[PDB]
């Protein structure tokens, strides 16, 4: 009876509002979908505990009073980016980059699993770890290799699921992500491709760049609020470094600058084996001649060979892949970037 | 129901009726509805590129069990580039003619409508219509305009077509790997546009278009001279041999100038000499034939 | 009610209204170029069975260029005086507007006006403002002019292939523009207007005096 | 271009009272300073008299000119060594003779976007025309003063039109005799041949270097507000001060008082100034081991 | 008089009936309102001297079509367009136009040629088109433009797009002066200070 | 499910009877807007919505025309458009966090080597607050306002900390990026509020840090649409002078760029004394090495003069970065102390990578 009276006390065409701020005096400020902001009153059955600046409520047409709080799948944008399942092969997938493995193991696993080296002496663990170098030098493969061998949760951010146009959704998901990093295990914040948001620190007069500079400043603020973080590890990765934010390269925030130099033909032979593993590799093919001839090719190129080797088998209606397919895939696919070398001059 | 429309009252805001005919505004550019515009044989020469397109569109659709039996997926990104355009439009219409399939044509400037969000809204409303009819091919045109390079914010950049471009990368890959939908991308000069979608994770096929050869120039010349009136004692091969690496587009230009010279004599007959003056007129290059620029460098 | 179509976008130019007062033979000196434009613009409108019998298919448009003071507009007005088809005057810097998107839309707006009307004739005066070749458009304004070139490029040879319409251009220097505009199929007449030499000065001296 | 008060329903012009401008132009309206005497500047009294014979009598006694039939000029330039008499002289002239001062900086005319200085200069003079007793003061004019000649990228647009809009505001098609213009530079060589002569300026008031007695005259005034012992030789001060302006001589006078403040001495000696002089240039290297 | 309702005129609709009450000639876009209302000098060719060979020659080309067209119908000539003032700064160039705008001022516009561009990239050529339409409508007008060098320049190659707008601004000024529209009763006094870097098409 | 704030019925059952009904018809709906300017002796307030229009309205007869200034939110009537109740722009959660009045854990011996600048800071801060008579007995004004400038990482904060623990009374650190707000005219009210509440108590020290944001940088040359850096800067130079003689609250600034220097601030009354910070010659560096190594387990048989010789041009931030790096080399192997070669490789890692 009483539930039906209050459900019929408000108006029926309830309008979807937007909270902006809260004053604790039975009224608040809200925002319509057209951006018109209305100094309206709030009721008392509205369950004043979940009211947060940035949520949505229900409004009236007559007085636009706050009818009730609105759910929004509670956060659709921090539960998608969280990894639940297992990544790729742990340590045997990569090869030749074992110089940098001691860096990332002692900076991540050693503050967590054995936090006694830091207590015998009194040396604090590092927070920021930067991965830069050539474009596609094996930064994605390395980040999944470290995240497999873990005992804590892991976070995977694309970098383009951070910038919206709602003027508050930028700095909102920073607190949404770090709360998930706080409520769960001391996870690894992996926000990939931070170069599109953080560069050169420019301020303009339009309403296009203002959603970037605040969110850049609020993330730098929320990373180093210096109140209680609970040993959050942050891995940041871009390709380039020279058009990036200089005040994150300075000490006090990040003291690890890990570079990934170019590999050799030694690391290739596993990558040829790994890519030619989940296929019908016939026993009449040769891969070692394909390694010896070509002297510049990456993991994307070998995978582009393996798909072209897979396509040529399906054209003439076969199941396995013959050796001439691998030869013709080596001579068709790999002829796109071979340009520029000083041969016959150097010794 | 997904993307369902309703009839809504205007005063009480109550439902009136479920609407049929799912959301697709501005389908005048789409659903071309007329198949006969060009036949198949009127291209000639470039016969390898036809078999690459027939087996990347009709072969995954008509015979999907060939590709679903190996263990790899099907390609869905096709890039086409030719810097003078040695057949880009004519090749697509003959595919659109001889397919028996629904076709979608998308011009590359119609997403910037007036103001913010609106051109970004019609992206998701477009491909659901191509998902509504699973036999459908989407054809882009001059993607040089739509997406060049991710610049900075509002200072020295647009930062508005970035909002629409970011959807197109995400609408085909990232939420659900779509099926039975093949896009065709046709623009030349591949340095202006972004290379982010040019990775093999998105585009599996990059078919170039070379300038035609001597037999290829000869066969296009026989197509355009087929509807014309010819006099005996003429050699079409030498006309192709007087074209040092032509474009194929100027095969029309020879056949226009030859018939126009026969027009001003009120004569339906044409000699080889009329074609020889037609080729030499179009061959206006800034080559500086002093026999001293190409001749100090033997 | 349902309106008659094109209750809509901008100016119906003249077609009889303020049409330029020049005769065809008022031109002094131009004989080949005076005949060449007529043979690809006016003569297609009058004598049509001659083209379909031979299989000529007269060109879609004409590019005119050369130094200033040779006669571009005055020759075009003699075409605009003696045509019976629809003329269309277009300033080349008419689509430069601030409002983003409307630039490429106005090119779309003019061509739908040409398709509903007569076998029309489109004249755009300056092309060097809009047709320059492309690069990494590192500003906002360079991306503005660049995409309107391509909407112009699409609605001249696409799948529809707009019939019976002619696009007349008359630049100042036709090398600082896009090479896919100079390909034959849209502009088949690369007509130069050079400076008048001897045997033509006495023709121009006659027509003035 | 008026901001009238219109009814929301009947659309009737009810009240007008606009009085609105750009925020940058209203930021430039700088008035109501503490006063300053002409006796504060020593040694440049001829240039002071050439200013009193330039600006105040067109303002005070207009009937002094209209009976002779001559027309007063409206452009006066301060140039010479920086830091001597350029901004400080017109600060005191606006202090005593109140005539609604209006400064104008050089690099503030140079904005990022194209076509901003021609907006800003012309809005600065529409405000100057409506305020009839107002004057115009322009400082660091050499920062926008090029020669119009070297068409070099990319200063042919951001400096040139801001110059040439300003040049059109001096004489123009229409006269402007209501407001007076005072310019202050450091470089005469870099200025446009239109940014000089009569109509615009012509009143090249050069500033020489302050001499020994002039430097002795500047230091006495700045030391008058503090406690100075009467046993101070101005011959020694005029001798030891070499190639100083009044700004540096003021900086010596501050440092001589602070050293006496450290030891708690309520007086000054010549050694207090000899310490204050050597403190300015941050006394440094004795030798270079090249010069025996 | 519905024949006066040309397709492209301006009218005033009712607030409630929405039908046409009164038609209006044209907007006059108040940026150029100030470019008409000003007094030159109330001069009478007596504040000028030592230039009478050039004064009269300029008065010949301008004052005759706006007063005496019978001398141009008797001889098979088209009445001419405007002239140009070039030379070193100081000898006239503004007082000379100030002289001719005091004698027979039917309509007059003084363009500064530096308040005609701004931040907006398509504003410059829009302002010129609406300027001459005001000049075209009020038939016997005279146009003065100081400092053509500000928007002049030789039309050159790749030029860092801030200068590309000035070229597109200049190409608009070319076709409005001598283009498709027959400019009648409108004459244009251009004035510069360096006549070297202007367009040969101009 | 459609929850809509269920609130299980024990806390709102009395509230849902008629208190909702008295919130419907008497309690009207207002809108928050912006004030452009005002007029004298007659209100005539010009107010925009920025989405609708600009309106010339008046306050209603419930409030007084005393608090209503330029740039303030108001309660606009839905029909008559009158100001009912003025709204403050969310005051004031940026003062209690600043004036913490908390003891800092910085030893006075943590600034060594640059002793000449400590006494210069000792005379400006400590002396006119505890012995102001010497300034009275002679006839020089008490100095107020000293700008700090120099290379970054020199110890700008530590010198600003060495005066903080000295008197332990009302230490306020203003972050320069904090006053950079979104709302127009947001920080300029705070500089009024931070000044008036610092004068309620005596012997208060306010420090301005990173004045490259708001402390007169580029005064107005890049912001052509925003105009907030100018409106705060013009407000603070106005409220600094006009009052406060003889010393009640000392104000200090520090920058990194020696370019953002106003001559109007160098008018006597705002900024008088120049105190800059410089690099250590030999011993101020070794003062840093000895402090940044007692906190970790090191070898008691090593020296720190050799490390400062290997650092020709370095700051204490860089020296701290070596001590963190050299600590990790002992953590690579199973070493529980810091040997010399860990420092030697760290110096070759930091300096001989990108510096020289
Ligand atoms: N192989 C060919 N067969 C038939 N016609 C051809 C061929 N190659 C070129 N052409 C002619 O060239 C002209 C241009 O062809 P198409 O429209 O496909 O290229 P395009 O994409 O417009 O060129 P661009 O990329 O320069 O815009 C057409 O008129 C066509 O008739
Ligand atoms: N051959 C000619 N016969 C008659 N009049 C001519 C001739 N050539 C030029 N003129 C005159 O010269 C003037 C300039 O010609 P026009 O207006 O056509 O210039 P344009 O060729 O359009 O290009 P531009 O304006 O760059 O020179 C015309 O008004 C015309 O009267
Ligand atoms: N030839 C002249 N005869 C009489 N007076 C002149 C002459 N030239 C200049 N003047 C005087 O110069 C003033 C007008 O300046 P003027 O218009 O000549 O400058 P300007 O040449 O337009 O400068 P700029 O060329 O730099 O724009 C008037 O006060 C007038 O007395
Ligand atoms: N003759 C003088 N008398 C008094 N003060 C002087 C004198 N010369 C220079 N000064 C001081 O030098 C400072 C700089 O002068 P200023 O007008 O700023 O020159 P500029 O504008 O070229 O730098 C002034 O503030 C003034 O206090
Ligand atoms: N005398 C000193 N003793 C110890 N450490 C010092 C000394 N001087 C400077 N430092 C170091 O220099 C650093 C200065 O950091 P910071 O306050 O960021 O400088 P700034 O404020 O100039 O940017 C401090 O972290 C401190 O470790
Ligand atoms: Mg094409
Ligand atoms: Mg012309
Ligand atoms: Mg002049």
Automatic annotation (TrEMBL), chain E:
ADP 1 binds at residues 47, 49, 90, 93-95, 98. It comes from Homo sapiens (Human). ATP 4 binds at residues 49, 90-95, 193. GO terms for molecular function: ATP binding; ATP hydrolysis activity. It comes from the Eukaryota. ATP 5 binds at residues 49, 90, 92-94, 193. Residues 79-202 form the AAA+ ATPase domain. Belongs to the AAA ATPase family. ADP 3 binds at residues 90, 92-95. ATP 6 binds at residues 90-94. ATP 2 binds at residues 49, 90-95, 193. This is 26S proteasome regulatory subunit 10B. ATP 3 binds at residues 49, 90-95, 193. GO terms for cellular component: cytoplasm; nucleus; proteasome complex. ATP 7 binds at residues 91-94. ATP 1 binds at residues 49, 90, 93-95, 193. It is found in: Cytoplasm; Nucleus. Keywords: Acetylation, ATP-binding, Coiled coil, Cytoplasm, Metal-binding, Nucleotide-binding, Nucleus, Proteasome. Mg(2+) 2 binds at residues 94, 146-147. Mg(2+) 1 binds at residue 94. ADP 2 binds at residues 49, 90-95.
């Amino acid at each position: 009876e009483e539930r039906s009276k209050v459900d019929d006390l408000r108006g029926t065409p309830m309008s979807v509002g937007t909270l902006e701020e809260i004053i604790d005096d039975n009224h608040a400020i809200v925002s319509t979908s057209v951006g018109s902001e209305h100094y309206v009153s709030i009721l008392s059955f509205v369950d004043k505990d979940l009211l947060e600046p940035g949520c949505s409520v229900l409004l009236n047409h007559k007085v636009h009073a706050v009818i009730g709080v609105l759910m929004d799948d509670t956060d659709p944008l921090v539960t998608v980016m969280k990894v639940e399942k297992a990544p790729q092969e742990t340590y045997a997938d990569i090869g030749g980059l074992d110089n940098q493995i001691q860096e990332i193991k002692e900076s991540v696993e050693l503050p967590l699993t054995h936090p006694e080296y830091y207590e015998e002496m009194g040396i604090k663990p590092p927070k920021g770890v930067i991965l830069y170098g050539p474009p596609g030098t094996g930064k994605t493969l390395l980040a999944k290799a470290v995240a497999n061998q873990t005992s804590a949760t892991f976070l995977r951010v694309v970098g383009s699921e951070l910038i919206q146009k709602y003027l508050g959704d930028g700095p909102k998901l920073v607190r949404e992500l770090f709360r998930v990093a706080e409520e769960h295990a001391p996870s690894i914040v992996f926000i990939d491709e931070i170069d599109a948001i953080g560069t050169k620190r420019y301020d303009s007069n339009s309403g296009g760049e203002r959603e970037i500079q605040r969110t850049m400043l609020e993330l730098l603020n929320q990373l180093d609020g210096f109140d209680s973080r609970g040993d959050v590890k942050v891995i940041m990765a871009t390709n380039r470094i020279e058009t990036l934010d200089p005040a994150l390269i300075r000490p006090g925030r990040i003291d690890r600058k890990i570079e990934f130099p170019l590999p050799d033909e030694k690391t290739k032979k596993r990558i040829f084996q790994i890519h030619t593993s989940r296929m019908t590799l016939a026993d009449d093919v040769t891969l070692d001649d394909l390694i010896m001839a070509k002297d510049d090719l990456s993991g994307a190129d070998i995978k582009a060979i393996c798909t072209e080797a897979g396509l040529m088998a399906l054209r003439e209606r076969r199941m396995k892949v013959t050796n001439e397919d691998f030869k013709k895939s080596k001579e068709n696919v790999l002829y796109k970037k071979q340009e520029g070398t000083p041969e016959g001059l150097y010794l | 129901t997904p993307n369902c429309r309703v009839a809504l009252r205007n005063d009480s805001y109550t439902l009136h009726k479920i609407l049929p005919n799912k959301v697709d505004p501005l389908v005048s550019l789409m659903m071309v509805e007329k198949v006969p515009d060009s036949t198949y044989e009127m291209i000639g020469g470039l016969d390898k590129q036809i078999k690459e397109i027939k087996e990347v569109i009709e072969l995954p659709v008509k015979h999907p069990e060939l590709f679903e039996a190996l263990g790899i997926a099907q390609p869905k990104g096709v890039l086409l580039y030719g810097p003078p355009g040695t057949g880009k439009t004519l090749l697509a219409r003959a595919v659109a003619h001889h397919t028996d399939c629904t076709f979608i044509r998308v011009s590359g400037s119609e997403l910037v409508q007036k103001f913010i969000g609106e051109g970004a809204r019609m992206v998701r409303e477009l491909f659901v219509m191509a998902r509504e009819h699973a036999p459908s091919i989407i054809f882009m045109d001059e993607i040089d305009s739509i997406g060049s390079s991710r610049l900075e914010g509002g200072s020295g950049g647009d930062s508005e077509v970035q909002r629409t471009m970011l959807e197109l990368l995400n609408q085909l890959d990232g939420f659900e790997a779509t099926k039975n939908i093949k896009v065709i991308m046709a623009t030349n000069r591949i340095d202006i546009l972004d290379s982010a979608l040019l990775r093999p994770g998105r585009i599996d096929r990059k078919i170039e278009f070379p300038p035609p050869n001597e037999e290829a120039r000869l066969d296009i010349l026989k197509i355009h001279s087929r509807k014309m009136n010819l006099t005996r004692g003429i050699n079409l091969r030498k006309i192709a041999e007087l074209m040092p690496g032509a474009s194929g587009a100027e095969v029309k230009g020879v056949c226009t100038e030859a018939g126009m010279y026969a027009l001003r004599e009120r004569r339906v007959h044409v000699t080889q000499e009329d074609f020889e003056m037609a080729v030499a007129k179009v061959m206006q290059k800034d080559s500086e034939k002093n026999m001293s620029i190409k001749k100090l460098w033997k | 009610d349902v309106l008659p179509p094109e209750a809509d976008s901008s100016i119906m130019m003249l077609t009889s209204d303020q049409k330029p007062d020049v005769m065809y033979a008022d031109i002094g000196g131009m004989d080949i170029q005076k005949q060449e434009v007529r043979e690809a613009v006016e003569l297609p409108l009058t004598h049509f069975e001659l083209y379909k019998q031979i299989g000529i298919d007269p060109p879609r448009g004409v590019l005119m260029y050369g130094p200033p003071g040779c006669g571009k507009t005055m020759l075009a007005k003699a075409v605009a005086h003696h045509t019976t088809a629809a003329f269309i005057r277009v300033v080349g810097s008419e689509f430069v507007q601030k409002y983003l998107g409307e630039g490429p839309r106005m090119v779309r707006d003019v061509f739908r006006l040409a398709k509903e009307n007569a076998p029309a004739i489109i004249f755009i005066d300056e092309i060097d403002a809009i047709a320059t070749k492309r690069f990494d458009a590192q500003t906002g304004a360079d991306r503005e002019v660049q995409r309107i070139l391509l909407e112009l490029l699409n609605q001249m040879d696409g799948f529809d292939q707009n019939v019976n319409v002619k696009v007349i251009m008359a630049t100042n220097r036709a090398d600082t523009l896009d090479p896919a505009l100079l390909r034959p199929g849209r502009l088949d007449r690369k007509i130069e207007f050079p400076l008048p030499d001897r045997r033509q000065k006495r023709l121009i001296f006659s027509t003035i005096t | 271009g008026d901001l009238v008060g219109v009814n929301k329903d009947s659309y009737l012009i009810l009240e007008t009272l606009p009085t609105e401008y750009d925020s940058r132009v209203k930021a430039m309206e700088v008035d109501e300073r503490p006063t300053e005497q002409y006796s504060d500047i020593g040694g440049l009294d001829k240039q002071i008299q050439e200013l009193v014979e330039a600006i105040v009598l067109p303002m005070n006694h207009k009937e002094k000119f209209e009976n002779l039939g001559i027309q007063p000029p409206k452009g006066v330039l301060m140039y010479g060594p920086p830091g001597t008499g350029k901004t400080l002289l017109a600060r005191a002239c606006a202090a005593q003779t109140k005539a609604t001062f209006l400064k104008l900086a050089g690099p503030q005319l140079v904005q990022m976007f194209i076509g901003d200085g021609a907006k800003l200069v012309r809005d600065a003079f529409a405000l100057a025309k409506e305020k009839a007793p107002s004057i115009i003061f322009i400082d660091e004019l050499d920062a926008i003063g090029t020669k119009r000649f070297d068409s070099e990228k990319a200063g042919d647009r951001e400096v040139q039109r801001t110059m040439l809009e300003l040049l059109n505001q001096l004489d123009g098609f229409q006269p402007n005799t209501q407001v007076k213009v005072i310019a202050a530079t450091n470089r005469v060589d870099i200025l446009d041949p239109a940014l000089l002569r009569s109509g615009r300026l012509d009143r090249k008031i050069e500033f020489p270097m302050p001499n020994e007695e002039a430097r002795a005259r500047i230091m006495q005034i700045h030391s008058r507000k503090m406690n100075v012992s009467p046993d101070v030789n101005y011959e020694e001060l005029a001798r030891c001060t070499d190639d100083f302006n009044g700004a540096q001589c003021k900086a010596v006078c501050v440092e001589a008082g602070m050293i006496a403040l450290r030891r708690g001495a309520t007086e000054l000696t010549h050694e207090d100034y000899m310490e204050g002089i050597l403190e300015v240039q941050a006394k440094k290297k004795a030798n270079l081991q090249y010069y025996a | 008089d519905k024949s006066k309702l040309k397709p492209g005129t301006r009218v005033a609709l009712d607030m409630t009936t929405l039908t046409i009450m009164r038609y209006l000639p044209r907007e006059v876009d108040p940026l150029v309102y100030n470019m008409s209302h000003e007094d030159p000098g109330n001069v009478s060719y007596s504040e000028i001297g030592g230039l009478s060979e050039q004064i009269r020659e300029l008065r010949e080309v301008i004052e005759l079509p706006l007063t005496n067209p019978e001398l141009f119908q008797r001889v098979g000539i088209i009445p001419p367009k405007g002239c140009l003032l070039y030379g070193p700064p100081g000898t006239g160039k503004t007082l000379l136009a100030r002289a001719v705008a005091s004698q027979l001022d039917c309509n007059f516009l003084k363009v500064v040629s530096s308040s005609i561009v701004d931040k907006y990239i398509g504003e410059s050529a829009r302002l010129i088109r609406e300027m001459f339409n005001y000049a075209r409508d009020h038939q016997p007008c005279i146009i003065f433009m100081d400092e053509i060098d500000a928007i002049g320049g030789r039309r050159f190659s790749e030029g860092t797009s801030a200068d590309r707008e000035i070229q597109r601004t200049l190409m608009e000024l070319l076709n409005q002066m001598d283009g498709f529209d027959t400019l009648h009763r409108v004459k244009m006094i251009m004035a510069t200070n360096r006549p070297d870097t202007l367009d040969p098409a101009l | 499910e459609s929850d809509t704030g269920l609130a299980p019925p024990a806390l709102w059952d009395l509230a849902a009877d008629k208190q909702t009904l008295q919130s419907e018809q008497p309690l009207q709906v207002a809108r928050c807007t912006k004030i452009i300017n005002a007029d004298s002796e007659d209100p005539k307030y010009i107010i925009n919505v920025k989405q609708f229009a600009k309106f010339v309205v008046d306050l209603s007869d419930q409030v007084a025309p005393t608090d209503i200034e330029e740039g303030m939110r108001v309660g606009v009537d839905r029909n008559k458009y009158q100001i009912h109740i003025p709204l403050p722009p969310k005051i004031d959660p940026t003062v209690t966090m600043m004036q913490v009045e908390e003891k800092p854990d910085v030893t006075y011996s943590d600034v060594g080597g640059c002793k000449e600048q400590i006494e210069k800071l000792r005379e400006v801060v400590e002396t006119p607050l505890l012995h102001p008579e010497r300034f009275v007995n002679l006839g020089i004004e008490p100095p107020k306002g000293v700008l700090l400038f120099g290379p970054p990482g020199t110890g700008k904060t530590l010198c600003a900390r060495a005066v903080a623990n000295r008197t332990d009374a009302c230490f306020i650190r203003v972050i320069g990026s904090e006053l950079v707000q979104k709302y127009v005219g947001e920080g300029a009210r705070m500089v009024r509020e931070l000044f008036e509440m610092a004068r309620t108590k005596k012997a208060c020290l306010i420090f301005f840090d990173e004045i490259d944001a708001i402390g007169g940088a580029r005064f107005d040359d890049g912001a052509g649409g925003d105009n907030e850096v100018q409106r705060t800067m013009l407000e603070l130079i106005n409220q600094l002078d006009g009052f406060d003689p003889r010393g009640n609250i000392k104000v200090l600034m520090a920058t990194n760029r020696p370019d953002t220097l106003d001559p109007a601030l160098m008018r006597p009354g705002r900024l008088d004394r120049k105190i800059e910070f410089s690099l250590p010659d030999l011993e101020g560096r070794t003062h840093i090495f000895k402090i940044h190594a007692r906190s970790m387990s090191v070898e008691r048989d090593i020296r720190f003069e050799l490390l400062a010789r290997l650092c020709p041009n370095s700051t204490g931030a860089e020296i701290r970065s070596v001590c963190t790096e050299a600590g990790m080399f002992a953590i690579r192997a199973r070493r529980k102390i810091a040997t010399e070669k860990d420092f030697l490789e760290a110096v070759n890692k930091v300096i001989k990578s990108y510096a020289k």
